[PDB]
Amino acid sequence: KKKPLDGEYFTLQIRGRERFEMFRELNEALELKDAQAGKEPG
Amino acid sequence: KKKPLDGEYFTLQIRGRERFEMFRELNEALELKDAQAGKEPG
Amino acid sequence: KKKPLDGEYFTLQIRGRERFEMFRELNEALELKDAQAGKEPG
Amino acid sequence: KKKPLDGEYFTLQIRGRERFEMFRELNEALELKDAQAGKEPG
């Protein structure tokens, strides 16, 4: 489904349960932008 | 060394090498604040 | 255009030109998520 | 007090009161790192 070559994946340890949800949130945020980056500007 | 009970640890996958360094940076940032949180206010 | 009552707006000073672009990026990131939050799940 | 030439300052609008506190938090986080960057490594 799109994305031909998969870029190198990485990982990061985040102490704290509530704090973890915060980092993951920013992760999906930027990922959302990159997702619409494949759609023409109009 | 301080920190008696260790809080639950977690992890997060971050695609992209350059992007990874960015997330890790914010991680050490907040961790730096919590580190000085154990020092009296003066 | 949608968004009836405007929520209280705020501001934050960010020293550094390159650093500024970084913060603004995360700003548009979360804003992008909230933008698709008004669209039904399918 | 240290910091001879002040770097160009900037600003960013953040909608949402609770959300604002979140951004400001990351701001002080990186600023805390830069603060210890002036102290020798030991």
- DSSP states of D20-33 as a string? HHHHHHHHHHHHHH
Does the distance separating the beta carbons of A14 and B27 come in below 8 Å? yes
Beta-bridged to residue A9, according to DSSP, are B15
Which tokens sit at D34? 């830069």
Q: Is D20 on the interface with C (CB under 8 A)?
A: yes
Pick the CATH number of A1-42 from 4.10.170.10, 3.40.50.300, 2.60.40.3080, 3.30.30.60: 4.10.170.10
Hey, what amino acid is at B22?
A: M
Q: Is D12 on the interface with B (CB under 8 A)?
A: no
Helix (H) or strand (E) holding D18, with range, is helix D17-36
Q: What are the chain A neighbours of C28 within 8 Å (beta carbons)?
A: 33
